Design a protein around this ligand. Structure first.
Ligand SMILES: *[C@@H]1O[C@H](CO)[C@@H](O[C@@H]2O[C@H](CO)[C@@H](O)[C@H](O)[C@H]2NC(C)=O)[C@H](O)[C@H]1NC(C)=O
Ligand SMILES: *[C@@H]1O[C@H](CO)[C@@H](O)[C@H](O)[C@H]1NC(C)=O
Ligand SMILES: *[C@@H]1O[C@H](CO)[C@@H](O)[C@H](O)[C@H]1NC(C)=O
Ligand SMILES: OC[C@@H](O)[C@H](O)[C@@H](O)CO
Lengths: 719, 146
């Protein structure tokens, strides 16, 4: 083909300076033939829509004519990000910064104002007091760890030392930003990835989900302005990105606003960085927003929620690394809590809001200097060892669990695993004793200790010793979670949230832990339990139909929380070969792993395999079945035969089950020791309120480790 | 698993003009232009803004390398214009404003081609234009991901 573009002429009053170098002899007769290369020159062959009728022009320019805290890098050279933009599909297949039609991001309360540059409802992280020392992370003693709420480490040399860094928005629709990075926080699972990049004066945050479009927030000093780059329709002036109006220290920009609530969440998110300087206030609101999740989506993703949660955690890491540099110090209690709660929230967000499975959650925090981190982790490992030997305190052993949790290492979880199992055992004895496991210090210990006995399942492939240890902890926490404890745990949480203002009075989920969230009880949101939770509730100013709905939602949070695929996978015996017929797979309402070999499962339907018992005297509309599963395809129906007792009767290891005609299961108590076996062989002494007696008309079962289920006549309570 | 629009072997100007208009791969596909590691103008001999193509094919010719890189039409346009708008004289700059107004004119010729497609679903790392597989803990030319 024939190319004959219109080179200009030195005379041209307009494109004249663009005529070709004499050298070339670019006459109208020569311009085909190509041969447009001239060393000292760059040529631009422009052609428009009307080609060939308009043969397009050939322009010539000499090559030489082309040659503090948070800065936009504009142009193609010598912008390091240039290449990444030029590779992108921006504006080719996506529009990452669409035309905003009056899309508005209102200013918000708590939003930093000229009066309060940190926030209206901010509660600033206090400075280390006058003349307090600032040790290195090496001379760290167990005594330090105990007075840890008042032991300060100097941030310099512990914190990552800032160094220049270029941030490329994933949209490729914004100029690269040059910053001094202070590290980052990233987390995700098999169905979501969030990545925050911190810089002095800046945060770069991408939230992505499997089945939802991404969200991007870019936080910068208030006097900076970020344009949307590459949209040809903004030839006059580039279209500044949408976002909230600029506060006192920060201005926030957003990409990929839209679908009602998606927009709402994203407003909340662009609001978060200006609201506080205390990593804690974010954590608190995070743990609160997590208890408010709607039951309806089930185990599906909740994009609205996850955005709010992920933005809260990223924002807390921003407040944390910021607060540090500020008064150049980190309270040891804050370092440990930040590392612990980061790990805790990232999991609750990914599991409850991104629809994921715990065995896939990950979290890479990197606000610390890498070398200092390795040192810190080595020392902490050693104190985990020391604590378990030197100290006797419950406070100390729970610090040892929480330390293993922060390290998230097999070695760590190794030292403390026996300790945690032995504690769980002790609490069951306190509960069988008649006491309540309500002291905050106790719940926090129960929280991390169950976390510890669970960790091997999440890392895959547990040892025989590791399975046995967790199985017993599950038989126990399921026993601890009676109907009464459940109803109570609704009242406590309701009362806890009421008390919090997210500043002076924070809300730490771990301190309000219940066995229910680490049980194998997934019936907690059924009808009979909501009624329990309501009759033991304090009157409020919420319509009855709503308070009931609010309850069901929290019931559902606790069951979803407690439901780990990896555990169910591990304590429901499957057969070695495929079983004929259509599996009637009913999801276990209660799972009782009574022997390492076998488990009982409580469901609303017969299963096709296993010894199956059908509970009698139970409302036909909401029936109860107890099935004894082992690795076999065989099934047998069996009647539940009645029995009386009466020095060793062989009850130990068996499980006591109380259920109502209403179809509710009140307690699944493990017959632990011999003392508990005798407490049972006597009967239900009047005026001796065991955990084995109820005032509610109900039937008593005893489930033996070997598959037989009997009817403890003597423990029934009639109307 | 993801793809690249590789460079074209280009020893002569015609090796470029020969090349037919790039067709746009499926929505299925995760592709990316192969661009130069860095944009150096003392290393670019010709710029082919072929805006008569449905995809605004723009080619960056490095003669010494004998490669022509096909790159993002819109971001190249935006960026190159910017680099020309920089003050860095009067002849030097008058020439520049010239080439500027002439590029900007042809770009606007096609301002109705920019996408309206909202960015699609799936995890990002670290570029919408890279692959969107979700990675977890239990973990037209090809570049299988690592
Ligand atoms: C599973 O274990 C229990 C253990 O008590 C067995 O119950 C026994 O059944 C006999 C039948 O006459 C009774 O004397 C007692 O109720 C039990 N004996 C003991 C040892 O206390 C039950 O039969 C066992 N079932 C299987 C399948 O072996
Ligand atoms: C260009 O053409 C002129 C006139 O024919 C001739 O004198 C000259 O040699 C040519 N220049 C080159 C570089 O070939
Ligand atoms: C383990 O499983 C087998 C087969 O299900 C069973 O026969 C055996 O009794 C079990 N072992 C123990 C220690 O109970
Ligand atoms: O019942 C619950 C179990 O987890 C399922 O695998 C099957 O129903 C067993 O038959």
């Amino acid at each position: 083909r024939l190319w004959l573009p219109n080179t200009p002429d030195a005379s041209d009053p307009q494109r004249g300076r663009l005529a070709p170098p004499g050298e070339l002899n670019l006459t109208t007769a020569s311009v085909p033939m190509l041969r447009w290369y001239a060393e000292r020159f760059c040529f631009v062959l422009v052609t428009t829509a009307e080609f060939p009728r308009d043969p397009g022009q050939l322009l010539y320019i000499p090559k030489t004519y082309l040659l503090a805290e948070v800065t936009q890098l504009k142009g193609l050279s010598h912008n390091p990000g240039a290449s990444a933009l030029l590779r992108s599909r921006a504006w080719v297949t996506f529009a990452a910064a669409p035309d905003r039609e009056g899309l508005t991001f209102p200013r918000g309360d708590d939003g930093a104002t000229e009066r309060h540059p940190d926030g209206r409802r901010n509660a600033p992280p206090p400075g280390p007091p006058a003349g307090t020392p600032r040790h290195p992370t090496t001379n760290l003693s167990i005594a330090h760890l105990h007075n840890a709420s008042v032991t300060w480490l100097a941030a310099r040399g512990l914190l990552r030392t800032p160094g220049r860094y270029v941030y490329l928005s994933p949209s490729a629709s914004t100029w690269p930003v040059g910053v001094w990075t202070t590290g980052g926080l990233a987390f995700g699972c098999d169905a979501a990835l969030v990545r925050a990049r911190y810089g002095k004066g800046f945060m770069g945050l991408v939230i992505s989900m499997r089945d939802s479009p991404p969200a991007e927030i870019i936080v910068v000093p208030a006097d900076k302005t970020l344009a949307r780059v590459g949209n040809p329709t903004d030839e006059n002036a580039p279209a500044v990105l949408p976002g909230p109006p600029a506060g006192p220290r920060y201005r926030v920009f957003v990409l990929g606003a839209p679908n009602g609530s998606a927009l709402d969440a994203l407003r909340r998110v662009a609001g978060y960085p200006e609201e506080s300087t205390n990593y804690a206030q974010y954590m608190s609101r995070a743990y609160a927003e997590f208890l408010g999740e709607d039951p309806g989506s089930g185990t599906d993703a909740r994009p609205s929620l996850f955005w709010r949660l992920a933005g809260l955690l990223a924002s807390s890491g921003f407040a944390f690394v910021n607060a540090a540099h500020a008064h150049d110090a980190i309270r040891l209690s804050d370092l440990l809590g930040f590392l612990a709660h980061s790990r805790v929230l990232a999991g609750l967000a990914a599991r409850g809001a991104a629809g994921c499975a715990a065995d896939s959650v990950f979290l890479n925090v990197s606000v610390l200097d890498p070398a200092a981190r390795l040192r810190l982790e080595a020392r902490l490992g050693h104190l985990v060892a020391a604590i378990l030997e030197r100290e006797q305190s419950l406070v100390a052993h729970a610090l040892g669990y929480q330390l293993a949790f922060v390290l998230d290492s097999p070695a760590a979880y190794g030292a403390v695993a026996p300790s945690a199992a032995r504690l769980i055992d002790a609490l069951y004895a306190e509960f069988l004793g008649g006491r309540a496991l309500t002291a905050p210090m106790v719940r926090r210990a129960l929280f991390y200790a169950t976390a510890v006995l669970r960790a091997p399942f999440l890392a895959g492939a547990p040892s025989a010793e590791q399975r046995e240890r967790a199985r017993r902890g599950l038989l126990i926490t399921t026993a601890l979670c009676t109907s009464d404890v459940a109803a109570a745990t609704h009242a406590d949480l309701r009362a806890a949230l009421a008390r919090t203002d997210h500043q002076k009075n924070l809300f730490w989920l771990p301190d309000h832990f219940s066995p229910c969230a680490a049980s194998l009880r997934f019936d907690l949101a059924e009808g009979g339990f909501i009624l329990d939770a309501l009759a033991m509730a304090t009157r409020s100013d919420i319509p009855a139909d709503v308070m009931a709905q609010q309850t069901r939602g929290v019931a559902s949070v606790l069951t979803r929380w407690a439901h780990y695929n990896a555990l169910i996978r591990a304590f429901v015996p499957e057969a070695t070969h495929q079983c004929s017929g259509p599996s009637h797979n009913a999801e276990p309402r209660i799972l009782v792993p009574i022997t390492h070999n076998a488990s009982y499962v409580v469901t609303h339907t017969p299963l096709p395999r296993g010894i199956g018992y059908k509970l009698t005297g139970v409302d036909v509309r909401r029936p109860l079945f107890i099935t004894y599963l082992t690795a076999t395809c065989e099934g047998h129906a069996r009647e539940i035969e009645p029995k009386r007792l009466v020095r060793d009767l062989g009850l130990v290891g068996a499980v006591f089950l109380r259920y109502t005609p209403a179809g509710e299961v009140m307690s699944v108590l493990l017959v632990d020791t011999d003392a508990t076996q005798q407490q049972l062989a006597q009967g239900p002494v009047a005026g001796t309120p065991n955990v084995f007696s109820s005032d509610v008309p109900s039937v008593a079962l005893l489930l033996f480790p070997n598959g037989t289920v009997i009817h403890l006549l003597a423990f029934d309570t009639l109307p | 698993t993801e793809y690249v629009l590789r460079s074209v072997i280009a020893k002569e100007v015609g090796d470029i003009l020969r090349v037919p208009c790039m067709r746009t791969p499926a929505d299925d596909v995760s592709w990316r232009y192969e661009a130069p590691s860095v944009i150096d103008y003392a290393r670019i001999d010709g710029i082919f803004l072929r805006y008569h193509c449905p995809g605004l094919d723009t080619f960056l010719w490095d003669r010494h390398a004998q490669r022509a890189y096909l790159v993002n039409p819109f971001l190249f346009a935006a960026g190159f214009l910017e680099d020309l708008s920089h003050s860095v004289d009067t002849q030097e700059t008058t020439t520049r404003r010239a080439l500027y107004k002439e590029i900007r004119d042809a770009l606007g010729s096609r301002k109705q081609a920019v996408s309206h497609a909202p960015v699609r679903a799936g995890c990002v790392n670290f570029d919408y234009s890279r692959t969107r597989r979700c990675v977890g803990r239990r973990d037209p030319v090809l570049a299988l991901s690592n």
